[PDB]
Ligand binder design. Structure first.
Ligand SMILES: CC(C)(Oc1ccc(CCNC(=O)c2ccc(Cl)cc2)cc1)C(=O)O
Lengths: 265, 11
């Protein structure tokens, strides 16, 4: 099937994934299904239930509801970028890179990786929030005003098709590593070497998908398509973030998030 | 230009 140094590359990536993302698909699916517990997550389905939830998040304000949700999103984004950064540094070859190429890979990778992993925490009707303690409804997110209602629905559309692939966490960690180790991000210095590094990951991903989903024989090309869709998804999402920076005088981006969007698409 | 991201990659 596949050799040792490829098997070693796979488990390094899976273990780094298990270590760096508190929420993962196995844990999310159990909450969502959901056996293992009869105490479901608090459901945030309208303005009133939202305020109930916020009465808990006291220390962590008087802004419009849309903007407060926009703030909860930023907090979740910041720490996922943070975890993603730890995860990247653990991919063999990544830390060896120019450091600059590392910033560039992360800059263009993180949001494709975020929306890939976000699927895990979404079903057709809503998504887990607050580390699995909440569940905010899709319809409620659509019910917000523009352009805030226009942020999640595309992510849901992607997630429903992506979740149809039935990936588990071992697939997803390889997929996320391939997203980040992407040889054609703009401004990369050592395109030749990064490309070598990604073809190793992509190779481990292909053989792993053969072994883990034998009947779904075009799963890998499907995943390749998903990577192109993620790029489009992120470009459009970047466009919406720009429209908000210069149209909503009350939704400042976290500094780290300004770093990533600055000079992107 | 990416000072926080640099920071994160060092620690
Ligand atoms: C925050 C922003 C503007 O857009 C994004 C929106 C959502 C997500 C996914 C992570 N967000 C969550 O898990 C999340 C947490 C709480 C609430 Cl009320 C909604 C969503 C990531 C990014 C971004 O680009 O960072």
């Amino acid at each position: 099937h596949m050799t040792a140094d490829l098997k070693s590359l796979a488990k390094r990536i899976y273990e780094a994934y298990l270590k760096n993302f508190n929420m993962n698909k196995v844990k999310a699916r159990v909450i969502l299904s959901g056996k293992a517990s009869n105490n479901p997550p608090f459901v945030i389905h309208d303005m009133e239930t939202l305020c109930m939830a916020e009465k808990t998040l006291v220390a962590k304000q008087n802004k419009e509801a849309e903007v407060r949700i926009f703030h909860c999103c930023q907090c979740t984004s910041v720490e996922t970028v943070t975890e993603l950064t730890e995860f990247a540094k653990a991919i063999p070859g990544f830390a060896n890179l120019d450091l600059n190429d590392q910033v560039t890979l992360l800059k263009y990778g993180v949001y494709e990786a975020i929306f890939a992993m976000l699927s895990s925490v979404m079903n057709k009707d809503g998504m887990l929030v607050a580390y699995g303690n909440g569940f905010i409804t899709r319809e409620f997110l659509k019910s917000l005003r523009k352009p805030f209602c226009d942020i999640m629905e595309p992510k849901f559309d992607f997630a429903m098709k992506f979740n149809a692939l039935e990936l588990d966490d071992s697939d997803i960690s390889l997929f996320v590593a391939a997203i980040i180790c992407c040889g054609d991000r703009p401004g990369l210095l050592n395109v030749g070497h990064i490309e070598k590094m990604q073809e190793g990951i992509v190779h481990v991903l292909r053989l792993h998908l053969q072994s883990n989903h034998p009947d779904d024989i075009f799963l890998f090309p499907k995943l390749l398509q998903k990577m192109a869709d993620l790029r489009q998804l992120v470009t459009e999402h970047a466009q919406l973030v720009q429209i908000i920076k210069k149209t909503e005088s009350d939704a400042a981006l976290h500094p780290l998030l300004q770093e990533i969007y600055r000079d992107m698409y | 230009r990416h000072k926080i991201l640099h920071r994160l990659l060092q620690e």
